[PDB]
DNA sequence: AACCGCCAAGGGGATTACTCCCTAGTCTCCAGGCACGTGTCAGATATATACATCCTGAGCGTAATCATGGTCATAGCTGTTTCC
């Protein structure tokens, strides 16, 4: 049981704290909310005191709290609704390539929205030392064969990501019928 | 209610190529506009009167002030009454 970092949109920080209490009450988590002073007593007392397991913050708070969070090495950076990361220049991306966690569990509700460029934008922060490349990934696959429309080289895209990534749909396993 | 991040997409600023026709240089030409004489008029000049206007009281009005009277308040005196 160690240091954990999870991120939720402002509207959703209640739910994750609510569900963690309902299901596994043994984990120390905070909703890191409040004012500049009201975030401080969280910083020095509990966050600096290493008196927690997970920390629930918002999109901007981590940017507001980048410096007091670097000094704590993490286990995962749990990223719900990972849509702000679609842009590499979205400032949240440059604040997350700076933290040092052993694993980096990105989470989403919907997959990539528009482009292959976007796909490895999610993918490049997953295993950065492996790719370390931006346009190399792109012209390697050449955008679903945008010129020849072979639509068979897409199988190579699928074959790497199938044992590297997991999709399930509601229609298959209803759970709601 | 500013700040700051964020988000996508037209929008027009940039760049490249080209074409061309208008302005430049020359050159031929001439009358317009600038120097060059000249008279006449409208500003300058020189008084005289009409008039405005300021100045300082001629006087007049107005208020401020002192005078003056009346009136009321209070004090003093005495007459009345009651009590020993």
From Swiss-Prot:
Coiled-coil ranges (or none): none
Protein name in UniProt: ISWI chromatin-remodeling complex ATPase ISW1
Residue ranges annotated as motif DEAH box: 80-83
Domain of life: Eukaryota
Annotated compartments: Nucleus
Protein species of origin: Saccharomyces cerevisiae (strain ATCC 204508 / S288c) (Baker's yeast)
Record family assignment: Belongs to the SNF2/RAD54 helicase family. ISWI subfamily.
Covered range of the whole protein: 245 to 421 of 1129
Additional detail: Present with 1500 molecules/cell in log phase SD medium.
Subunit structure and binding partners: Component of the ISW1A complex, which at least consists of ISW1 and IOC3. Component of the ISW1B complex, which at least consists of ISW1, IOC2 and IOC4.
Stated role: Catalytic component of ISW1-type complexes, which act by remodeling the chromatin by catalyzing an ATP-dependent alteration in the structure of nucleosomal DNA. They are involved in coordinating transcriptional repression, activation and elongation phases. The ISW1A complex represses gene expression at initiation through specific positioning of a promoter proximal dinucleosome. The ISW1B complex acts within coding regions to control the amount of RNA polymerase II released into productive elongation and to coordinate elongation with termination and pre-mRNA processing.
Domain Helicase ATP-binding: 1-129
């Amino acid at each position: 049981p160690g240091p954990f970092l999870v991120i939720a949109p402002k509207s959703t920080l209640n739910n994750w704290l609510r569900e963690i209490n309902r299901w596994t009450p043994d984990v120390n988590a905070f909703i890191l909310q409040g004012d500049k002073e009201e975030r401080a007593e969280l910083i020095q007392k509990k966050l600096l005191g290493c008196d927690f397991d997970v920390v629930i913050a918002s999109y901007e708070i981590i940017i507001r709290e980048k410096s007091p969070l670097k000094k704590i090495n993490w286990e995962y950076i749990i990223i719900d609704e990972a849509h702000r990361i679609k842009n590499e220049e979205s400032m949240l991306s440059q604040v997350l390539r700076e933290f040092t966690s052993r694993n980096r569990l990105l989470i989403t509700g919907t997959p990539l929205q528009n482009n292959l460029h976007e796909l490895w934008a999610l993918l490049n922060f997953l295993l950065p030392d492996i790719f370390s490349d931006a346009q190399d990934f792109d012209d390697w696959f050449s955008s679903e064969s945008t010129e020849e429309d072979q639509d068979k080289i897409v199988k190579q895209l699928h074959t790497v990501l199938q044992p590297f990534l997991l999709r399930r749909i509601k229609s298959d396993v209803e759970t709601s019928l």
